[PDB]
Design a protein around this ligand. Structure first.
Ligand code: CU
Ligand code: CU
Ligand code: CU
Lengths: 9, 100, 276
């Protein structure tokens, strides 16, 4: 499964 | 933007056997950017009902795609894969050699 | 064997033809098992291998929620990248992102990844230490700035070491039938008369899983690394893979040449001659 959190470039 | 031209392989899923059902594959890889026209041709006419896998990419970020369709080979029918890409001045056509 | 899990993302802007196209796929080794295409009607992440269909509805609601927010995030980021590079809104651009982990026979992390590409060129990447970044330019330095002040490395590292390995190990159990079985290649040597003067010998390998394989044409036991034709490894379409290696040989000196096949599905490396 995928990581919950991403971050804006 | 560094644009890369697709490598093209047209080949059947199993070794071709005249009269036996098979799958015809057009494997395009190595290209950028991702927009691509890919058609499988049967004696020069575009085959309807061609499926395609989902856009994916290799380690170097170049894209690859598989187009495929049910077919049953005959000896007199010639198959080909036509591919148009930004890198291409004219659509490239690779005919299907069952030797390859 | 040695196993891996990767999630691939592509966002492709198309100014004047709606929102950017977002496609993402997930892989365990060379097996595709999830997909999410934003151009699908009412998009959810869908299964693409039988061993993931068993996951409950909460699994799939959580995956679809993630894919949607990611697609939103790349919509912001695509506009942000236009600022960082002083570009026009007229053009089409591409944001790629791959992250995932490698594990060994032990099930322990061998390596974690999380790297970005913009218009086909490396942008920012998490380094193998999972705690430092490599910025490809002064635009990606703006991100390395924003991501160092957020301790993104710490949070990627938490994911890549924990959950990534957790769930890959789980999938290797749910799909051990296929994920843990290697299909050995079926091998044959073909002989192609081109002209009166020479013929081509083609070393085939078909129906093998995984995709990792090495085909080598040796002349007198010496590798013809330079004069050997070698196609990129291609998908058969039923999960297995094909490849061939070929050399143009003079008629008569054929029996000097050996083809060596290496694949984890094979006990011993193979030694193949052209046999009439
Ligand atoms: Cu294993
Ligand atoms: Cu936001
Ligand atoms: Cu010969």
């Amino acid at each position: 499964r995928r990581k919950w959190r991403r971050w804006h470039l | 933007m560094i644009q890369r031209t697709p490598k093209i392989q047209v080949y059947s899923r199993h070794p071709a056997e005249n009269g036996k059902s098979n799958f015809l594959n057009c494997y395009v890889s190595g290209f950028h950017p991702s927009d691509i026209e890919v058609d499988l041709l049967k004696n020069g006419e575009r085959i309807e009902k061609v499926e395609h896998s989902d856009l994916s990419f290799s380690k170097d970020w170049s894209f690859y795609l598989l187009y495929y369709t049910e077919f049953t080979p005959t000896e007199k029918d010639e198959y080909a894969c036509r591919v148009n890409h930004v890198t291409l001045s004219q659509p490239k056509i690779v005919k299907w050699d069952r030797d390859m | 064997g040695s196993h891996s899990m990767r999630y691939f993302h592509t966002s492709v802007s198309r100014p004047g033809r709606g929102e950017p196209r977002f496609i993402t796929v997930g892989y365990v080794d060379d097996t595709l098992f999830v997909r999410f295409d934003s151009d699908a009607a009412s998009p959810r992440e869908e299964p693409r291998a039988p061993w993931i269909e068993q996951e409950g509805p909460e699994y799939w609601d959580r995956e679809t929620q993630i894919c949607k927010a990611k697609a939103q995030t790349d919509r912001e980021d695509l506009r942000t990248l236009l600022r960082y590079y002083n570009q026009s809104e007229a053009g089409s651009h591409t944001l790629q992102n791959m992250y995932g982990c490698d594990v060994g026979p032990d099930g322990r992390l061998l390596r974690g990844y999380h790297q970005h590409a913009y218009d086909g060129k490396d942008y920012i990447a998490l380094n193998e230490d999972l705690s430092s970044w490599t910025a490809a330019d002064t635009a990606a330095q703006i991100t390395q700035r924003k991501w160092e002040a957020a301790r993104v490395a710490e949070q990627l590292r938490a994911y890549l070491e924990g959950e990534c390995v957790e769930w890959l190990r789980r999938y290797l159990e749910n799909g051990k039938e296929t994920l843990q079985r290697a299909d050995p290649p079926k091998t044959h040597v073909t002989h192609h008369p081109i002209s009166d003067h020479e013929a081509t010998l083609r070393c085939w390998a078909l129906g093998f899983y995984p995709a990792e394989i090495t085909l080598t044409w040796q002349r007198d036991g010496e590798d013809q690394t330079q004069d050997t034709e070698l196609v990129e490894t291609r998908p058969a379409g039923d999960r297995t893979f094909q490849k061939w290696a070929a050399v143009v040989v003079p008629s008569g000196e054929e029996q000097r040449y050996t083809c060596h096949v290496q694949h984890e599905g094979l006990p011993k490396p193979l030694t193949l001659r052209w046999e009439p």
